[PDB]
């Protein structure tokens, strides 16, 4: 019975608009890992079903770095005469070491929005027929599905609310002295502008 297939499609639907390493992506795969208790090969199927080959390669490189540090530290819990981590994390009775591999595997995705040098949210600009409010909501969502969890999105959003605005709103914001004011004052200013 391929019950995992139906749940994998539901996971892929849940993270459909969520970037690799985004909070919503991480909530969904943290629950999925906790729910299925996957082996290293089942984590490989989860990675390949959800992500592009470039992202899988970047995840692998980040994970290899985290494994290499843990292995050189000697904090893994793995016997070096019992085979590689990628095989021991498939062993039937080695539960604490599967769980440790699952946490390294989950941890690696959290660096992906940080390594990214051209994320989508940085190219979101206010349209020519688009209200200033609708633009700020669009940015707020774009940051939420973009930035990793534990990021200060508030100074970023008031900066983007000026820098990625329509040229007419930027002149209005300069005239009104709202070049980097709190978001309520930015919106109160641009209430006076219509497309």
CB of 135 to its own copies, least distance (A): 13
CB of 164 to its own copies, least distance (A): 6
> Least distance to its own copies from the beta carbon of 124, Å?
10
Cα 143 to Cα 138: distance, rounded to the nearest angstrom:
9
Query: What DSSP letter does each residue of 95-128 carry, written as one string?
Result: HHHHHHHHHHHHHHHTTHHHH-SS-GGGG----S
Q: How far is the CB of 51 from its own copies (least distance, A)?
A: 9
Which of 129, 143, 127 is closest to 195 using CA atoms?
129
**C-alpha–C-alpha distance, residues 38 and 50, integer Å:** 15
With tokens 């390294």, the residue in question is: 104
Q: Tell me whether residue 135 or residue 164 sits nearer to its own copies (CB atom).
A: 164
């Amino acid at each position: 019975r391929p019950w995992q297939m139906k749940d994998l499609q539901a996971i892929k639907q849940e993270v459909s608009q969520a970037a690799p390493g985004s909070p919503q992506f991480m909530q969904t795969i943290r629950l999925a890992v906790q729910q299925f208790d996957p082996t290293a090969k089942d984590l490989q199927d989860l990675l390949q079903y959800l992500c592009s080959s470039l992202v899988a390669s970047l995840h692998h490189q980040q994970l290899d770095s985290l494994i290499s540090e843990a292995e050189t530290r000697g904090i893994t819990g793995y016997n070096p005469l019992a085979g590689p981590l990628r095989v021991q994390a498939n062993n039937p009775q080695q539960q604490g070491l599967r769980r440790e591999y699952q946490q390294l595997w989950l941890a690696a995705f959290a660096a992906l929005p940080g390594s990214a040098k051209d994320p989508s949210w940085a190219s979101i600009l206010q349209g020519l027929e688009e209200p200033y409010h609708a633009f700020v909501e669009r940015l707020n969502i774009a940051l939420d599905n973009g930035l990793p969890e534990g990021t200060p999105k508030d100074p970023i959003l008031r900066s983007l609310a000026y820098s990625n605005a329509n040229k007419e709103c930027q002149k209005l914001l300069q005239a009104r002295g709202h070049t980097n004011s709190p978001l309520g004052d930015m919106l109160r200013a641009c209430q006076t502008w219509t497309p």
